[model samples]
Target: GPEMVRGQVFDVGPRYTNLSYIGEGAYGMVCSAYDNVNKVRVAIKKISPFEHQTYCQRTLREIKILLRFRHENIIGINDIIRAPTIEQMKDVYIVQDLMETDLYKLLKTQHLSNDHICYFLYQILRGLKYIHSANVLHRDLKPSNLLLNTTCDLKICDFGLARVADPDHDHTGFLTEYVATRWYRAPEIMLNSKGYTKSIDIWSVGCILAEMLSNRPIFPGKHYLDQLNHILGILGSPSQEDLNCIINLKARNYLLSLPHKNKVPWNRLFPNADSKALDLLDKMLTFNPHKRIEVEQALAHPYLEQYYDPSDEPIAEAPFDDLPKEKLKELIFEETARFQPG
Candidate 1:
């Protein structure tokens, strides 16, 4: 079978028309669509032809990656469709299971208890472990990228930056300089290492965990050099090999010349944090990505064991009250017309 053309529009039927736009990003708009057949809610991400082509490809790739994964802790994609009007334009619509809110919104209103943090972190690790098992690298992992299901189960979302890892190759093709978000980027990425691996996600996990504890971003760097300096100020600089391993680190010159400052340790960062928790943080935020803790190993760490119980009641379900009335109406209309493909 021939691959579908990038801009070929198909009759997705009437279901798409009922969707109501809920959010927008630099590349596209996200809508809340209903799945009448499945009796479930779905997210419809619509990308424009005028948007960056890379964004469209990333969205499509994310759909591919999600289709291959079936885990409780990973967000799932249900379907994909092309725009109906523009067959030659680079427009796409991605359909995925709807989530109540991103982790960022959740964190804004509520302070996470140690138990809550442990539970969330454990779920994230479990999700990452699954992704790694699938040989997919979720290069971007941040609070904003995590979504909460109706059951409050934490699912990792947004695979736009994900890459397929080749076991035989030494990660030469992986771009070290093309880092993820500045705050969550791994040290190796900041230093421009070409031989990076799944450990980059682990580094992000560390930053996310630290942020949960502090209720603020752990490394609020304004730029690449500032990010390196922030990490160096806390963990000290990496060794020579660590510096030499990265491929295209933009901050290598700045990193080498900058004097180490031990201004804030994990303990000081989280003054009320337990020793076990602080210990875990130390391993997670290690200067060397190679030395950074793996998600599975972190799950087994005593810090998590001491705070989290697998049998504890799940976080309460998010109420649907927050949804606007107009959005609900649109969702209903979409559901009613779901059977008619555009």
Candidate 2:
């Protein structure tokens, strides 16, 4: 029997090796590794359960979501590993394609052509369409979470903040450490847009598109309040009907107190960019989440349509993963002791 490797990294494989440490997050550490049997390199995110209820809830929810997805634009889980037993457990390992860089890294080097923008936006919308079809909301969408391969292909990663499309409706996802990154975060989330929908993710995609064009973040605010103000400066104040939705009276009053501002012209913001792309970006950045363009509609928009095809749509329904919290914790330990299922 192959033994599980332990220490800085762990393994459940025919054979594997950690080439180097990649990074760390709230969940756990990640590293680059080689899959000897498959003859490919992969990135492994190792999440330790930490024997706390919150950690279990957050980690397992993310794991189950990753397991259910089978899409090209959305990153797929290559393998999973767990500790030997509940008592001895320390971490669960997630192995995935070893993307060479992230969208954040790509932005550093200047000169992304119109073709590059089209390709990136198409893949992002394709991924979002698949996710929304599953009734999921990827709450924390940002450039760092979007992995890019050497050939410019991209895959959406990181699901710790993602929920099953009931973002604001249920209190389950709230108060968790996961929230949208401040910059790409939607005004709806900041403004208490009651029972917001999957449109929040589209707002993020819009910010990414703008960042790709500008070589800088569109709303790099000092903090959360500043984030909303930045969004207001660019997108203008929300309509009165929209203003009426905030459950938080304090935030609502403060927002109303701010100076009146109108949306800056799209051409002024995206100077010299294609009109189709600019139009789509504006549509996604609307103050009202309901007005935000849906992923299916965005795909059909001319800005990126040439790069998409109906045949590429995944045939699988978005299966929901609502595992009992304890079930996932028990499975984490049992998983480490078995060989990969074929």
Best by TM-score: 2
Whole-model Cα lDDT per candidate?
A: 0.68, 0.76
Stretches of candidate 1 off by over 4 Å are 1-13, 16-18, 49-52, 83-90, 166-179, 239-254, 306-342
lDDT of 1 by residue, 1-342 (tens): 211223323234455444555676664667776666677668877655333445445544565567667777888767666533333434456677788888888878778888888888888887887787666788889998898865677989888778776434544432245647889987666454442377788888989988889788888888865776677767766677866755444455656666755546778779987788788888888876667787667877997775344443132122102444344333323332322264
Residues 251-272, model 2: lDDT tens digits: 6787778888988998998887
Residue 176 displacement (Å), model 1: 7.0
Worst 10 residues of 1 by lDDT: 312-321
Candidate 1 lDDT score relative to the true structure: 0.68
